[PDB]
Design a protein around this ligand. Structure first.
Ligand code: ZN
Ligand code: ZN
Ligand code: ZN
Ligand code: ZN
Lengths: 369, 101, 77, 81
DNA sequence: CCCGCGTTTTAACCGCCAAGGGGATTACTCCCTAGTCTCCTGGCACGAGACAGAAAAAAACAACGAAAACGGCCACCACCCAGA
DNA sequence: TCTGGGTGGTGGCCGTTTTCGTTGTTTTTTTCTGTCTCGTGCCAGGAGACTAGGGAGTAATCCCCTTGGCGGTTAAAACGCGGGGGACA
């Protein structure tokens, strides 16, 4: 191995009269071409597989002599004016300041205080647990002599004494609701890394359903008449769209007459993509909802941007206290149609009368004006 | 209030032993083994073709060798006063056979 | 590979023909047009439709080509 | 062809063990068996491909496999030879 | 930790179609190998001689096994702090 | 002022370290002997030169079967729950 000579290789007094070009050898035969090295022609295999078994007209050099350096517009610069692979705090992946002592690992923005990646304390960093381990020596008598003293010095809040005490010995932890509150709402469900999901989120598709589907399958229900199976699978009947009131599939000899149809994720009502104006099947993200369902957020302007949300579904804690019906009985919006988060039970005729008198007494009020 | 009919652990294992010592059909699925054979051969020569008979011969030889190896492995496992075969048993069988160094 | 690359609806063809050119699909299309008419019978005029396909043959002299192809196949089978 | 050794599923190894008279199988046995099978196939197919190359053929014939096995001391009957 | 049983999912298996790479064979021709006579020089057998190594005796040292010392843990006593 | 709890010091017991002598083995210098290596001579196996024949190389043809792909059925593989019997300390 010849030494990496400094090319200039000055001879007498820095005259650099003699040079020594570096040996290339490498950066050559590099085999980084998307094929074989750039200085070599196509391989015999590629040849066999691939083969099939006027410079005077170049008006390119005449470009520098017709390109005019252009400087208009502002142009003044407008001068002026071993170690864990998941974060032990949030249980996710990323860059980590692995502890020299503890096997646990944290993000840089999950520690306490958060630490800037470029402004690390460097040297050796200990987690709260190992700091406490070395501060306590793991024996119980000294820990007692320390913690009882802490409690004594915190008599003003002795009621909270040990809660205050135990914080110091705990590493930072991402906040997550305990299960005894999420369970109150059966609809909700945690995600893969805490992506807190609801009933409105579509079940994720697998790689088999996206990356392996052949030409004409998956999101590819846009490339062929192949998915003519917009026929009701369970019954074998035709999925009829709610608006046009017909199913369009044309023929294999007239695929241009077919119209895409989709079934709502919530209530399996078929809709034409061209009837509910849409450009694609969902297949991803959230669950599609017809334009035929009742609103959840009812943003109202009377600005008076008063919000109305439908109470989240409660565990079967849920109450349905029966009305005596007729007008009044102002529920917020919650209803359970029947033949403290109390889902009111409005039956059928009450709605009729309530709408009837709403619109009529409003028209008489308009008369009042 | 009824309980299903769960066979005691080790019963269905013995039934399977009897069934598979009684029969002769190949136990490894054919397509996965063919794919494995081609993948292994890809490291010795590219664009190789295999006679179906060649793949079948390889499968028969491999299955016979594995069955004999498992017989020896079971013998070693029993020698250690065990009933379960463990990787150390296979290693000892191969070492005594002279296959593994 | 060039002209093949631009052959989207033709590379899947020859497999979609096998599926969609069959008895089941052929009755399915006609039955569906009939169902659409009967749905605009449930929700639109009841009596009117007396057909569901309108196959047209503007050009003669194609029948003879179909017959020639059939004859060739017959002679080959 | 990638990750085809896992094509020798756990139940297939279980069946092979049962034919071998094994009643109880440890969980770690499957990976060890896959490794052993890979070694055996590598040893056999090496010689089979050597025979194929010597014959100046692009196709590995069953007789090449039979010769390879006979060379290794595992004579196989029923495929010629 | 592994067997057993049960839903649930995957892909193996079958069968059927289309394509052509390459196995297998045939015919032609020549270049390579067998065969043979004559020539000789490399390899073998025999003899010899001497130094590499076996042996050996003695010393050095390098693994095996007891009581004292040091350190750690447990128990008891003394002192200090906290509670009654 | 008395009793209980905790800390500090002292004593006792256990574990570890060292500390020592004892055999056993390794190393070192001297001796000497017999097998390894070299030389000599002969001969027979290898080389050289030449002829003859056919085994195999090479081109051309063809017809098998190996590859690829595609769809339908469903058998098998996977994943999970649960318990108990086997590993193992
Ligand atoms: Zn984090
Ligand atoms: Zn730490
Ligand atoms: Zn809907
Ligand atoms: Zn529509």
């Amino acid at each position: 191995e010849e030494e990496p000579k400094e090319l200039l290789e000055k001879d007498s007094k820095g005259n650099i009269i003699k040079l020594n070009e570096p040996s290339t050898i490498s950066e050559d035969s590099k085999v980084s071409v998307t094929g074989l090295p750039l200085n070599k022609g196509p391989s015999e295999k590629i040849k066999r597989e691939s083969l099939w078994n006027n410079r005077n007209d170049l008006k390119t050099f005449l470009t520098e002599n017709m390109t005019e350096e252009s400087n208009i517009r502002s142009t003044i610069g407008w001068n002026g004016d071993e170690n864990e692979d998941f974060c032990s705090a949030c249980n996710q992946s990323g860059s980590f300041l692995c502890c020299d002592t503890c096997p646990k690992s944290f993000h840089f923005l999950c520690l306490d205080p958060p630490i800037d990646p470029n402004n690390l304390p460097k040297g050796d960093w200990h987690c709260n647990e190992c700091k406490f381990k070395i501060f306590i020596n793991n024996s119980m008598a000294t820990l007692k002599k320390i913690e009882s003293n802490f409690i004594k010095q915190n008599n003003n809040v002795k009621i909270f004494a040990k809660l205050l005490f135990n914080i110091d010995s705990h590493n930072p932890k991402q906040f997550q609701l305990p299960n005894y509150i999420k369970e109150t709402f059966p609809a909700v469900k945690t995600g893969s890394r805490g992506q807190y999901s609801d009933e409105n989120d579509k079940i994720p598709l697998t790689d088999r359903q996206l990356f392996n589907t052949s030409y004409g399958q998956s999101i590819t229900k846009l490339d062929s008449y192949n998915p003519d199976t917009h026929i009701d699978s369970n019954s074998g009947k035709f999925l009829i769209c709610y608006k046009c009131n017909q199913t369009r599939l044309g023929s294999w000899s007239h695929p241009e007459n077919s119209r895409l149809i989709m079934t709502c994720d919530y209530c399996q009502t078929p809709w034409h993509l061209d009837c509910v104006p849409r450009a694609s099947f969902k297949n991803l993200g959230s669950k599609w909802k017809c334009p035929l369902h009742s609103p959840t957020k009812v943003y109202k302007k009377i600005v008076n941007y008063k919000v109305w949300k439908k109470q989240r579904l409660i565990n079967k804690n849920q109450l349905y206290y029966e009305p005596l019906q007729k007008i009044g009985y102002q529920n917020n919006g919650n209803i359970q149609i029947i033949p403290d988060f109390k889902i009111t039970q409005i039956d059928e005729n009450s709605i009729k009368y309530d709408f009837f008198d709403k619109i009529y007494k409003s028209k008489m009020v308009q008369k009042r004006k | 209030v009824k309980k299903p009919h769960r066979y005691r652990p080790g019963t269905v294992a013995l039934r399977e032993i009897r069934r598979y010592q009684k029969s002769t059909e190949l136990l490894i699925r054919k397509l996965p083994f063919q794919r494995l054979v081609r993948e292994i051969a890809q490291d010795f020569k590219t664009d190789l073709r295999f006679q179906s008979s060649a793949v079948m011969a390889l499968q028969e030889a491999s299955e016979a060798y594995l069955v004999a190896l498992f017989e020896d492995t079971n013998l070693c496992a029993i020698h250690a006063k065990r009933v379960t075969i463990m990787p150390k048993d296979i290693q000892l069988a191969r070492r005594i056979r002279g296959e593994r160094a | 590979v060039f002209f093949k690359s631009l052959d989207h609806l033709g590379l899947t063809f020859k497999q979609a023909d096998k599926k969609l050119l069959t008895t089941k699909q052929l009755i399915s299309e006609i039955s569906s047009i009939k169902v659409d008419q009967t749905n605009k019978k449930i929700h639109w005029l009841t009596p009117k439709p007396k057909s569901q396909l309108d196959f047209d043959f503007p050009d003669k002299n194609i029948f003879y080509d179909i017959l020639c192809l059939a004859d060739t196949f017959i002679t080959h089978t | 062809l990638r990750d085809n050794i896992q094509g020798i599923t756990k139940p297939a190894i279980r069946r092979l063990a049962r034919r071998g008279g094994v009643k109880r199988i440890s969980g770690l046995i499957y990976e060890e068996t896959r490794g052993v099978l890979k070694v055996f196939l590598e040893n056999v197919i090496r010689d089979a491909v050597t025979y194929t190359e010597h014959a100046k053929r692009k196709t590995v014939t069953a007789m090449d496999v039979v010769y390879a096995l006979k060379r290794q001391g595992r004579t196989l009957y029923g495929f010629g030879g």
